[PDB]
């Protein structure tokens, strides 16, 4: 049997913040703080497509040709 464990991230005043919680109450000693320029978390995306919360994979470009060749 497993138990779910979550993590939260908040970005403000160029100072990222995080903490760990399980079953609705925070785990003691898991707090942290550092400047945004030295953040430990990095988000990436393949093709920078503006106004999108998630990017597009490169292979999506040739998905159609892949399917046609397969068939």
């Amino acid at each position: 049997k497993m138990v779910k464990i979550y993590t939260c991230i908040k970005f403000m005043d160029d100072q990222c913040h995080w903490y760990q919680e399980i079953k609705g109450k925070e785990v003691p000693g898991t707090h942290g703080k550092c400047a945004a320029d030295v953040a430990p978390w990095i988000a990436l995306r393949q093709d920078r497509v503006d106004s999108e919360m998630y990017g597009r994979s490169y292979v999506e470009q040739y998905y159609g040709d892949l399917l046609a060749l397969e068939n």
Binding site: C8, H17, E26, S57, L69
Partner: protein, 71 residues
């Protein structure tokens, strides 16, 4: 035991509590918008590499298919 998934380089004392909802509620709220890109990535993976990104019920006892092209 000692839940140490985060480094103790920037650890600090408790600075935020539960002022408004829980991380589980926010996760459940954002998964609705996260849905579609996961489906796109899963389909692309299935057409290129059968078992890279997996469905939630194709783990310990899931079977993967094979394509008819290796490009």
């Amino acid at each position: 035991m000692k839940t140490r998934l985060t480094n103790n380089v920037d650890r600090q004392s408790a600075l935020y509590g539960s002022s408004g909802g829980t991380a589980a509620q926010r996760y459940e709220q954002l998964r609705v918008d996260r849905n579609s890109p996961l489906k796109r990535a899963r389909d692309c993976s299935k057409v290129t590499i059968p078992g890279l990104i997996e469905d939630e019920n194709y783990g310990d006892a899931g079977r993967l298919d094979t394509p008819y092209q290796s490009s």
